[PDB]
Amino acid sequence: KTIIINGVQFNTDEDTTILKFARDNNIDISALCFLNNCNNDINKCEICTVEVEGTGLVTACDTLIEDGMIINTNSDAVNEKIKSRISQLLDIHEFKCGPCNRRENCEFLKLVIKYKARASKPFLPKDKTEYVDERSKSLTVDRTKCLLCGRCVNACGKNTETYAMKFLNKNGKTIIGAEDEKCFDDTNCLLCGQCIIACPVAALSEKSHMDRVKNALNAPEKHVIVAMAPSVRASIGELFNMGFGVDVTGKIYTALRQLGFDKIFDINFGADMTIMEAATELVQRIENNGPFPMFTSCCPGWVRQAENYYPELLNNLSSAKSPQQIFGTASKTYYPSISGLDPKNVFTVTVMPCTSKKFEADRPQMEKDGLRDIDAVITTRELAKMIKDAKIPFAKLEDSEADPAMGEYSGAGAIFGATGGVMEAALRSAKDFAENAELEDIEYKQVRGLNGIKEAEVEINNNKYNVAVINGASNLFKFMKSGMINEKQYHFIEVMACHGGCVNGGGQPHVNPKDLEKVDIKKVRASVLYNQDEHLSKRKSHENTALVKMYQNYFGKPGEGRAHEILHFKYKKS
Ligand code: 402
Ligand code: SF4
Ligand code: SF4
Ligand code: SF4
Ligand code: SF4
Ligand code: FES
Ligand SMILES: [Mg+2]
């Protein structure tokens, strides 16, 4: 093929789109609705417009290159077309970036500035009530910002295959939303928030818990515990221009103390708790062989998927609570026993890469004696805004350390945030439990990586067993519908709703579509977690000394008695 772009001749054999070929050759072409190898098929944004000699204006994102093409990307005809489309977008857009939560990383704003477009008439609603949906515990919609780009719809379809996010004909006007414009919570939605990640503007956002946290911090009698997820320490640095794959664990601990938190713990401690219970349960299910297979239950996105599509698998779920909820339960019981705090004055706050964790925290039965396991959940993004509002120089902060009582963790807990992390951590303890030994080779590299479905054979005391790792909600559908589950007898199965694991959660920092082409965000975020595992002295959950102390002095032996009564949760089918 011979291609002419802006006067420059190219010789190539590649078969691809005009957009992709120009990006690879350092030729600038703007785009808006093109994402995840998809554009808005029904109403294309046409921001990727180029001029092909002899044909006219075309969309570069979905037009293949042909030999003999002469292409102009910057002609006056092209720029006025693009500028016209942006101006029409401005006509339906509340353009007040001041108090906007995407102000410093909005894609639409960069386009408005680049082409210097203005609205035919500013869109200024008097009552945003009709435009805003805040009914969900996890997700919120602001349709005064929505560009109808369809990127959230496509992301939902690709990541989950549920299509819980749809286009809707509302009063004869097109919107996006849940089925029959119901609250997302009341549909087959998983609340994974992958739609939010895909959104170029502030139309989709997480349900804010920042007022819960601030009211608690200022309440004199409240003792506010904070604990962050594995993934947060490996990603929040992005929002402070520190780059990708930067471990900022110690900086976060310092920042949380300066925010006014009374106690600094860590969810990885809770991760070690979940392994103690789940590995014991797996070893138990082997003594009786069954019921097989055992599924993990630490991902609420997956739990909802099971409830909504495969309720017969609910009885196969591990009864152990998620690290978030199991940590919260201990924070209202064990922690007062070693602090003398009144349990009702304890207020437990987690930092999560996940929107679905808000729903899990607000489950009705996720409490005991009137005390919630978790009282508030804030996302990575929420923590970042909170730090900036306090004007805390995050990048310059010195490393501090979490409080030891529920802040220590092993390398097994550390890797929870990556896909296959839970599988590997559980095998390290369950294999030591059943064989009654302390094995030294603890790395399970087969269950790692970004493959959608991963499988391995393991030998646990005398015998062979089959494990599988499901990476992404759409892959769960494939595993089940294709009958892969019935090809052999599986004994232990890990399921994560977000592809890549929690490091790619719905509450994570946004990334510019082109930076995504430079950086593999899923592996770069996960590398930090495996790094910590490598350089940690303790790499098994049952070697966690602060955790062993807790079980010996308070809970007893994991998997039965006291431990089973309050550190476990069961899901019932209607
Ligand atoms: N609870 C919990 Fe988990 C833990 O530990 C997080 O905190 Fe995850 C992360 N990062 C999230 O959200 S949930 C799914 N299990 C793997 S990691
Ligand atoms: S979505 Fe972007 S362009 Fe619209 S108000 Fe917010 S920052 Fe400004
Ligand atoms: S909610 Fe966001 S991603 Fe979805 S159509 Fe509107 S602007 Fe696009
Ligand atoms: S939260 Fe997840 S399942 Fe629900 S609409 Fe968004 S992407 Fe789809
Ligand atoms: S994979 Fe992690 S971030 Fe995604 S829904 Fe599940 S728990 Fe939340
Ligand atoms: S980016 Fe090509 S039509 Fe939208
Ligand atoms: Mg206070």
Numbering used by the authors: 2 to 575
Quote the passages of the study that discuss this structure, keeping the authors' original sentences.
Hydrogen (H2) turnover in [FeFe]-hydrogenases is proposed to occur at the distal iron site (Fed) of the [2Fe2S] moiety (2FeH), which is part of the H-cluster. The binuclear metal cofactors of [FeFe]- and [NiFe]-hydrogenases have been suggested to oxidize H2 by enhancing the acidity of H2 in the presence of a base, thus facilitating its heterolytic cleavage into a proton (H+) and hydride (H−) as a first intermediate step. According to the current working model for the catalytic mechanism of [FeFe]-hydrogenases, binding of H2 to the oxidized active ready state (Hox) results in the heterolytic cleavage of H2, with Hhyd as the first intermediate.
To verify that an interference with the PTP enhances the population of the Hhyd state under H2 exposure, we blocked the PTP in HydA1 and CpI via site-directed mutagenesis at two strictly conserved positions for each protein. Position 1 (C169 of HydA1/C299 of CpI), which was shown in earlier experimental data to be involved in catalytic proton transfer, marks the most proximal position of the PTP to the 2FeH sub-cluster, while position 2 (E141 of HydA1/E279 of CpI) is situated more distant from the H-cluster. To probe the structural integrity and unequivocally connect the monitored effects to an interrupted PTP, we solved the crystal structure of CpI E279A. The X-ray structure illustrates a fully intact H-cluster and overall identical structural features compared to wild-type CpI, with the exception of the clearly diminished electron density at position 279, which is in full accordance with an exchange from glutamate to alanine. As a consequence of this non-conservative exchange, the path of polar side chains is interrupted between S319 and the harnessed H2O molecule. Figure 4a,b shows the reaction of enzyme variants C169A of HydA1 and E279A of CpI towards H2 (black graph) at pH 8. Similar to the effect of acidification or sample drying, the oxidized state is lost in favour of bands at 1,978/1,962/1,863 cm−1 or 1,985/1,970/1,858 cm−1, respectively. When switching the purging gas from H2 to D2, CpI E279A and HydA1 C169A showed a selective shift to lower energies by 5–6 cm−1 of the band at 1,860 cm−1, which corresponds to the stretching vibration of μCO.
